[PDB]
Design a protein around this motif. Structure first.
Motif, PDB file in Angstrom:
ATOM      1  N   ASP A 117       0.899  -2.495  10.000  1.00 28.06           N
ATOM      2  CA  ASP A 117      -0.249  -2.888   9.398  1.00 28.06           C
ATOM      3  C   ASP A 117      -0.682  -4.413   9.998  1.00 28.06           C
ATOM      4  OD1 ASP A 117      -2.716  -3.350   7.923  1.00 28.06           O
ATOM      5  OD2 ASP A 117      -1.621  -3.378   5.989  1.00 28.06           O
TER       6      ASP A 117
ATOM      7  N   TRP B 189      -5.009  -0.959  -3.964  1.00 26.56           N
ATOM      8  CA  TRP B 189      -5.267   0.513  -3.362  1.00 26.56           C
ATOM      9  C   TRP B 189      -5.083   1.280  -4.701  1.00 26.56           C
ATOM     10  CZ3 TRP B 189      -1.418  -2.396  -1.087  1.00 26.56           C
ATOM     11  CH2 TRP B 189      -0.293  -2.003  -1.318  1.00 26.56           C
TER      12      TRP B 189
ATOM     13  N   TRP C 252       3.668 -10.085  -0.614  1.00 24.07           N
ATOM     14  CA  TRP C 252       2.771  -9.591   0.596  1.00 24.07           C
ATOM     15  C   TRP C 252       1.281 -10.173   0.448  1.00 24.07           C
ATOM     16  CZ3 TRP C 252       4.166  -7.302   4.886  1.00 24.07           C
ATOM     17  CH2 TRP C 252       3.199  -6.800   5.597  1.00 24.07           C
TER      18      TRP C 252
ATOM     19  N   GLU D   1       8.371  -5.983  -0.741  1.00 23.53           N
ATOM     20  CA  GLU D   1       6.856  -6.337  -0.954  1.00 23.53           C
ATOM     21  C   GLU D   1       6.582  -6.243  -2.340  1.00 23.53           C
ATOM     22  OE1 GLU D   1       4.536  -4.111   2.120  1.00 23.53           O
ATOM     23  OE2 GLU D   1       6.152  -4.200   3.565  1.00 23.53           O
TER      24      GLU D   1
ATOM     25  N   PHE E 176      -8.623  -5.478   5.146  1.00 24.38           N
ATOM     26  CA  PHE E 176      -6.975  -5.062   4.561  1.00 24.38           C
ATOM     27  C   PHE E 176      -6.090  -5.743   5.318  1.00 24.38           C
ATOM     28  CE2 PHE E 176      -6.167  -2.514   0.966  1.00 24.38           C
ATOM     29  CZ  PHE E 176      -7.062  -2.028   0.452  1.00 24.38           C
TER      30      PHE E 176
ATOM     31  N   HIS F  64       4.555   4.794  10.332  1.00 19.09           N
ATOM     32  CA  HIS F  64       3.689   4.746   8.952  1.00 19.09           C
ATOM     33  C   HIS F  64       2.682   6.083   9.337  1.00 19.09           C
ATOM     34  CE1 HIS F  64       2.396   2.481   5.288  1.00 19.09           C
ATOM     35  NE2 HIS F  64       2.234   3.758   5.060  1.00 19.09           N
TER      36      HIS F  64
ATOM     37  N   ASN G 292      -4.364 -10.658   3.518  1.00 17.86           N
ATOM     38  CA  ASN G 292      -3.488 -10.193   2.090  1.00 17.86           C
ATOM     39  C   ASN G 292      -2.926 -11.456   2.068  1.00 17.86           C
ATOM     40  OD1 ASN G 292      -2.309  -7.365   3.659  1.00 17.86           O
ATOM     41  ND2 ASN G 292      -4.144  -7.495   2.703  1.00 17.86           N
TER      42      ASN G 292
ATOM     43  N   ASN H  53      -4.570   0.138   9.857  1.00 14.08           N
ATOM     44  CA  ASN H  53      -3.320   0.027   8.889  1.00 14.08           C
ATOM     45  C   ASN H  53      -2.457   1.215   9.102  1.00 14.08           C
ATOM     46  OD1 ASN H  53      -1.635  -0.127   6.862  1.00 14.08           O
ATOM     47  ND2 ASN H  53      -2.972  -0.434   4.803  1.00 14.08           N
ATOM     48  N   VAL H  54      -2.550   2.213   8.533  1.00 12.91           N
ATOM     49  CA  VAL H  54      -1.600   3.362   8.636  1.00 12.91           C
ATOM     50  C   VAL H  54      -1.785   4.483   9.683  1.00 12.91           C
ATOM     51  CG1 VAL H  54      -0.605   5.601   7.618  1.00 12.91           C
ATOM     52  CG2 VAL H  54      -1.474   3.529   5.978  1.00 12.91           C
TER      53      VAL H  54
ATOM     54  N   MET I  71       8.588  -1.346  -2.506  1.00 14.09           N
ATOM     55  CA  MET I  71       7.305  -2.100  -2.142  1.00 14.09           C
ATOM     56  C   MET I  71       6.147  -1.873  -3.356  1.00 14.09           C
ATOM     57  SD  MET I  71       5.736  -0.425   1.351  1.00 14.09           S
ATOM     58  CE  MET I  71       7.038  -1.143   2.208  1.00 14.09           C
ATOM     59  N   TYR I  72       5.790  -2.910  -4.102  1.00 14.16           N
ATOM     60  CA  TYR I  72       4.887  -2.648  -5.263  1.00 14.16           C
ATOM     61  C   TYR I  72       5.293  -1.877  -6.305  1.00 14.16           C
ATOM     62  CZ  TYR I  72       2.803  -4.418  -0.819  1.00 14.16           C
ATOM     63  OH  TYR I  72       2.601  -4.978   0.463  1.00 14.16           O
TER      64      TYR I  72
ATOM     65  N   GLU J   9       8.425   1.561   6.622  1.00 12.62           N
ATOM     66  CA  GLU J   9       7.578   2.632   6.531  1.00 12.62           C
ATOM     67  C   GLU J   9       7.583   3.726   7.600  1.00 12.62           C
ATOM     68  OE1 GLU J   9       3.766  -0.084   5.673  1.00 12.62           O
ATOM     69  OE2 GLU J   9       4.038   0.803   3.573  1.00 12.62           O
TER      70      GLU J   9
ATOM     71  N   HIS K  82       0.588  -7.965  -4.097  1.00 12.03           N
ATOM     72  CA  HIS K  82      -0.200  -8.121  -2.829  1.00 12.03           C
ATOM     73  C   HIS K  82      -1.355  -9.184  -3.122  1.00 12.03           C
ATOM     74  CE1 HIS K  82      -2.788  -5.760   0.050  1.00 12.03           C
ATOM     75  NE2 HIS K  82      -1.848  -5.517   0.716  1.00 12.03           N
TER      76      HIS K  82
ATOM     77  N   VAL L 126      -9.192   1.905  -2.147  1.00  5.32           N
ATOM     78  CA  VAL L 126      -9.400   2.395  -0.783  1.00  5.32           C
ATOM     79  C   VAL L 126     -10.073   3.960  -0.878  1.00  5.32           C
ATOM     80  CG1 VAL L 126      -7.271   1.606   0.408  1.00  5.32           C
ATOM     81  CG2 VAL L 126      -7.092   3.754  -1.337  1.00  5.32           C
TER      82      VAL L 126
HETATM   83  C1  IPT Z   1      -2.969   1.309   1.551  1.00  4.36           C
HETATM   84  C2  IPT Z   1      -1.403   1.836   1.053  1.00  4.36           C
HETATM   85  C3  IPT Z   1      -1.604   3.475   0.780  1.00  4.36           C
HETATM   86  S1  IPT Z   1      -0.447   1.533   2.430  1.00  4.36           S
HETATM   87  C4  IPT Z   1       0.103  -0.226   2.138  1.00  4.36           C
HETATM   88  O1  IPT Z   1      -0.961  -0.802   2.830  1.00  4.36           O
HETATM   89  C5  IPT Z   1      -0.826  -2.341   2.625  1.00  4.36           C
HETATM   90  C6  IPT Z   1      -2.093  -2.959   2.870  1.00  4.36           C
HETATM   91  O2  IPT Z   1      -1.959  -4.563   3.221  1.00  4.36           O
HETATM   92  C7  IPT Z   1       0.359  -2.935   3.320  1.00  4.36           C
HETATM   93  O3  IPT Z   1       0.260  -2.783   4.860  1.00  4.36           O
HETATM   94  C8  IPT Z   1       1.691  -2.159   2.539  1.00  4.36           C
HETATM   95  O4  IPT Z   1       2.758  -2.408   3.339  1.00  4.36           O
HETATM   96  C9  IPT Z   1       1.221  -0.717   2.587  1.00  4.36           C
HETATM   97  O5  IPT Z   1       2.333  -0.086   1.624  1.00  4.36           O
END
Ligand code: IPT
Ligand code: MG
Ligand code: MG
Ligand code: NA
Ligand code: NA
Ligand code: NA
Ligand code: NA
Ligand code: NA
Lengths: 1015, 210
Positions: A193, A991, A560, A529, A593, A410, A596, A94-95, A494-495, A453, A532, A787
């Motif tokens: 991601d 998360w 998302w 976004e 992850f 990211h 989604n 992901n990141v 986002m979120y 990101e 989730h 997480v």
């Molecule tokens: C897990 C967060 C700290 S980052 C979070 O992860 C998501 C997982 O689907 C998406 O990729 C979102 O865009 C991202 O902000």
């Protein structure tokens, strides 16, 4: 030179010998073919069977490969990702970058895909004009050779790279060699991601253009105040020799009807002290009463651009679909054609479970139809420019598109480390400028995005201004650095939650209602976004939509996301299963992850998709007496393909129904008065259901498509009539170890040591495989899990709190078990305490009353310690001995529904196969619950009360212990969970804890009652 | 017809258990053939002399949400003090109870009546787990008010100075009470979450002598 220069480790080298970017070209040599968008003889596809060899590094590639086929190569389909052909592992992270963060360097072990094609070229293509090759998408960097000779180099995985092959080709057989690097300096800007894959994963093509050619054209549409008048403005640029006899004609067509036409020679207006552009011209066409483009009515015109001589000889034609629409932000509102949009949007990655990141038309159409059928009007290209056909399909079917530059960093620390660095500005600029140059003519594209990101850096500010300068027609958005920076026209978090602030340092996520009115803030807010949709999610989706409708400047958002990024793997039996992160030996990975989606990878809906559809409905309803008020949320269209079905039912039994034509103006009202309903016979709740039905098929829906629904409770008649007193009386048989109740051929067994109903008999047949026991836990949903924090998993997550408090290990201590004989019944009274390391978590007090009628009334009163984390559920469970084919219930359905995700569900009598009472989430969890249930029927059993239930062949324990759905095995009999109370599922994010307070089981004392009987 | 609805007895049984006597009752409240509420109760009197009252109420969904779900009676006793473990010490209602603190409170009876110039429901205390008045004790999780004035008399008197202390003491114990509102006082102002709309209600009390 190639191995020496290492262009893939240099952010200052993003290409070599690559041609300028431009709108889609076909180079028609016939104007009518251009007008009708028929195939062009000058645009050939090189897709098909190519030769491929995998190498661990570019240094390992043999020099001979430039000159002739490698015997060890395989013949493979292109476009493809080579991970999908099994040459190496796809990686889900992901990141965290899949490579060591050491910019601009990449690992020396850098998987290298060696593609080649032997293909033929017509002699006519080489005797005249220019032959170019177009690589629509190569991941992540590549060098290109033609007939042993080096042509050039390209970066950016998500935009076409074009090269002039005129000097390299021969008539007849030619051979391309393409060396594709998995990792490059480009990879640092591609940290989305998603699965990390590589190869020539989009179309390859050959385009023949004349030497004198259209090299670019831009189409703009400007309107008067009431949109009754438009000017179409076309800027056209040429390359090649300028001659006075050259002309450009731009004609505009509405179907077969030419609307307007204009001709000029080359030579633009004076620009500055040095003159103007001799190689450009701008045509202006007047359009009266233009049919306007929108997602509601995707009216399109066709613009044909002809390069020709004065005497009338066509040199070439190019063309595009034109949508007459104006996008602007005024007084803090995003307007389309003068009207405030409400974005019913979704993020969509380009993902296919078999083909990885290769897109096809069929899949794209399937996605769009499913989106429109579910009341989406908008899509965000998360997080890169899409396959070029996507925008054509959105133009024609009607979806608003956010086009997003392929820039995500990211995993940098801090997130803006590269985007604030002027050394990375050149690489960043190309990803933005070349996207705009490609896509600027698509009407569906209404917003430009600077990426995702990547923090907020000075490079964002530069590129934001570059876009505003070249294309004033579209707002620019960007979420990084706090969602409301100087690099965004739209507050696009986002979120961010509806009512709850999340005050993170530097980059807070304010409540969206609060964000709008922050001191000095004027911009519209549209979540890039939200909601989730990971596994069993979309809890609290209704809460977003209530706010979107109430607040003019909350103009919606993008869910998302669209589709689960699961991939197909095959076991020993050769049977396909759905795989996530780690399942390819990929490590580090972020496991499930990648999943989604609102739909599974094969486009089968998750239950959450129906909640989205209901909440995104374009008709609002109110009930007053016998009058139904229908409000249209359409901005442009009348309800000319809609009728209202209404239906009144008494506890599922139809009593009256009918249909009324809908004639509602955009934003208008219709009052529908219901006829006087017949008086209902018996006790029970009358329910009104309305549905909006589309009688006629459209491009995106079939006849009878249901677009909206709503339900209300009408009159309720409470049952006052006493049940006829049954003559039979149950007998109590007391043992040291058991209280047993008999009534004819029926036995109830209560274990005096455990305090539970351990068995029930109907003659010889056992009814239970496990006793009937309290349950306070669920197999954790993705939203319960969250997480890993670092030194440990995040202690704030629901599952972590439940585990630490001992909820999954709590053992029932019997406090009381007594039996009593009544006048016409036997009463069993029990009390249990659940304890963990000396701490009493829950106390359950029960009475079981078995009467002459054969019915068992269970009354449950539960105390929950105020200092234990709030439990996932308050209910009962048992394993029934029977497996039956059908499940019949009166309650909310037909689909899976949870307390914070039940608005879509309707109250009625539902009957489904047992397999449909299980939701096959790839990562197994609690699933298949149905709420507001008054009666449940399964085989010989009937349960009545006011409860939620799920029923399946899988225990909570198995669901809890199994990582993948394909590993699940049907257990003996049927597991039943009946809950008096169930915690919400949340999902604002996945998360951190996201279940709203009003859906947490925090009341401390809970009461519920059930009647168990035979049917 | 909430103010005019008459209780109709549907069931009244007595049972003898191993260590207790159980009374089971059921009532329906009707107005013009329409059933508004149904009340099902058990009274369980054991060897300790404690009467456990269990109450389950059904409220017709199409009837206006009721102002309270509770029990009332006029007690023969007039005691000087009221002692309770719950929210206090002042009058507090479900949508106006943030200032009240959970503790052991002990006031003179007169303090359990708020002398609003226009008489109305008054003096409620919420979140109460134990009430003590004279020889009586009530336990559970309830809302209560206690005064020398019936709801009927408060309903029929326009000024506070015209109220007369009735014989004994009126007790109102509610499982549930509707919010008082107040955003304005010329239209309905009780927020949805403070309206009694669940349809089915459960509460339990224990009455004893201590
Ligand atoms: C897990 C967060 C700290 S980052 C979070 O992860 C998501 C997982 O689907 C998406 O990729 C979102 O865009 C991202 O902000
Ligand atoms: Mg480079
Ligand atoms: Mg990311
Ligand atoms: Na809005
Ligand atoms: Na993800
Ligand atoms: Na219609
Ligand atoms: Na699991
Ligand atoms: Na009065």
């Amino acid at each position: 030179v190639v191995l020496q220069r290492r262009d893939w480790e240099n952010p200052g080298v993003t290409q070599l010998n690559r041609l300028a970017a431009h709108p889609p070209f076909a180079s028609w040599r016939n104007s009518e073919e251009a007008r009708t968008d028929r195939p062009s003889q000058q645009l050939r596809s090189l897709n098909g069977e190519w030769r491929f060899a995998w190498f661990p590094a570019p240094e390992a590639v043999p020099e001979s490969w430039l000159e002739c086929d490698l015997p060890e190569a395989d013949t493979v389909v292109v476009p493809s990702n080579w991970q999908m052909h099994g040459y190496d592992a796809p990686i889900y992270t992901n990141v965290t970058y899949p490579i060591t963060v050491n910019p601009p360097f990449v690992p020396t072990e850098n998987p290298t895909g060696c593609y080649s094609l032997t293909f033929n070229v017509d002699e006519s293509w080489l005797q005249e004009g220019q032959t170019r090759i177009i690589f629509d998408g190569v991941n992540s960097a590549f060098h290109l050779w033609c007939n042993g000779r080096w042509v050039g180099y390209g970066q950016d995985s998500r935009l076409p790279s074009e090269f002039d092959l005129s000097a390299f080709l021969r008539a007849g057989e030619n051979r391309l060699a393409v060396m594709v690097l998995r990792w490059s300096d480009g990879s640092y800007l591609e940290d989305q991601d998603m699965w990390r894959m590589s190869g020539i994963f989009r179309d390859v093509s050959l385009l023949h253009k004349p030497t004198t050619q259209i090299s670019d054209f831009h189409v703009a549409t400007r309107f008067n105040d009431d949109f009754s008048r438009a000017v179409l403005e076309a800027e056209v640029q040429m390359c090649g020799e300028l001659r006075d006899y050259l002309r450009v004609t731009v004609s505009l067509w509405q179907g077969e009807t030419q609307v307007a036409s204009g001709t000029a020679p080359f030579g633009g207006e004076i620009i500055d002290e040095r003159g103007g552009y001799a190689d450009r011209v701008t045509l202006r066409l007047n359009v009266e009463n233009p049919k306007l483009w929108s997602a509601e009515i995707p009216n399109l015109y066709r613009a044909v651009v002809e390069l020709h001589t004065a005497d009338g000889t066509l040199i070439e034609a190019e063309a595009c679909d034109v949508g007459f629409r104006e996008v602007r932000i005024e007084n803090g509102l995003l307007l389309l054609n003068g009207k405030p949009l409400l974005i019913r949007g979704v993020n969509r990655h380009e993902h296919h479970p078999l083909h990885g990141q290769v897109m096809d038309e069929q899949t794209m159409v399937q996605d769009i139809l499913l989106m429109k059928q579910n009341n989406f009007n908008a899509v965000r290209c998360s997080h890169y420019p899409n396959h070029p056909l996507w925008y054509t399909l959105c133009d024609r079917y009607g979806l608003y598109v956010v086009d997003e530059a392929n820039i995500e960093t990211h995993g940098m620390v801090p997130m803006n480390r590269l985007t604030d660095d002027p050394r990375w500005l050149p690489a960043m600029s190309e990803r933005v400028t070349r996207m705009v140059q490609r896509d600027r003519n698509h009407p569906s594209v209404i917003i430009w995005s600077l990426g995702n990101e990547s923090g907020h850096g000075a490079n964002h500010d530069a590129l934001y201004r570059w876009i505003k300068s070249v294309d004033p027609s579209r707002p620019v958005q960007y979420e990084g650095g706090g969602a409301d920076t100087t690099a965004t026209d739209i507050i696009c978090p986002m979120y961010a939650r509806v009512d709850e602030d999340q005050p993170f340092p530097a980059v807070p996520k304010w409540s969206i209602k609060k964000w709008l009115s922050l001191p000095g803030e004027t911009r519209p807010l549209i979540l890039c976004e939200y909601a989730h949709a990971m596994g069993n999610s979309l809890g609290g989706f209704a809460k977003y939509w209530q706010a979107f409708r109430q607040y003019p400047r909350l103009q919606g958002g993008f869910v998302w996301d669209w589709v689960d990024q699961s991939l197909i793997k095959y076991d020993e039996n050769g049977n396909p299963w759905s795989a996530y992160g780690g399942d390819f030996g990929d490590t580090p990975n972020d496991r499930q992850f990648c999943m989604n989606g609102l739909v599974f990878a094969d486009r089968t809906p998750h239950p959450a998709l129906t909640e989205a559809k209901h909440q995104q409905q374009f008709f609002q309803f109110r009930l007053s007496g016998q009058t139904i008020e229908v409000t249209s949320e359409y901005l442009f269209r009348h309800s000319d393909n809609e009728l209202l079905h209404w239906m009144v039912a008494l506890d599922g039994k139809p009593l009256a129904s009918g249909e009324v034509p809908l004639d509602v103006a955009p934003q208008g009202k219709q009052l529908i008065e219901l006829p006087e309903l017949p008086q209902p016979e018996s006790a029970g709740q009358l329910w009104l259901t309305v549905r909006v039905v589309q009688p006629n098929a459209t491009a995106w829906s079939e006849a009878g498509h249901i677009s909206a629904w709503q339900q209300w409770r009408l009159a309720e008649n409470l049952s006052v009539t006493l049940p006829a007193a049954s003559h039979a009386i149950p007998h109590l048989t007391t043992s040291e170890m058991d209280f047993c109740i008999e009534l004819g051929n029926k036995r109830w067994q209560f274990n005096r040591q455990s305090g539970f109903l351990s068995q029930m008999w109907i003659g010889d047949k056992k009814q239970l495989l496990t006793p009937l026991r309290d349950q306070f836990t669920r197999a954790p949903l993705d939203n319960d899990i969250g997480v890993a924090e670092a030194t440990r998993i995040d202690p704030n997550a629901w599952v972590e709190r439940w585990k630490a408090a001992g909820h999954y290990q709590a053992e029932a201590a019997l406090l009381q078990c007594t039996a009593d004989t009544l006048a016409d019944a036997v009463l069993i009274t029990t009390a249990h305490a659940w304890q963990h390391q000396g701490k009493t978590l829950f106390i359950s007090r029960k009475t079981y009353r078995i009467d002459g009628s054969g019915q068992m009334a269970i009354t449950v009163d539960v105390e929950v310690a105020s200092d234990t984390p709030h439990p996932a559920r308050i209910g009962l469970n048992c394993q029934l001995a029977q497996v039956a084919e059908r499940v019949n219930w009166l309650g909310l359905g037909p689909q899976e529904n949870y307390p914070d995700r039940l608005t879509a569900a309707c109250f009625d009598r539902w009957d489904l196969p047992l397999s449909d009472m299980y939701t096959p989430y790839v990562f197994p969890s609690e699933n298949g619950l149905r709420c507001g249930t008054r009666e449940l029927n399964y085989g010989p059993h009937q349960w009545r009360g006011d409860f939620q239930f799920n029923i399946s062949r899988y225990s909570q324990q198995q669901l809890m212990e199994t990582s993948h759905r394909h590993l699940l095995h049907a257990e003996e009999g049927t597991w039943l969970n009946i809950d008096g109370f169930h915690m919400g599922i949340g999902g604002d994010d996945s998360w951190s804890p996201s279940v709203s307070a009003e859906f947490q089981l925090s009341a401390g004392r809970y009461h519920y009652q059930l009647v168990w009987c035979q049917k």
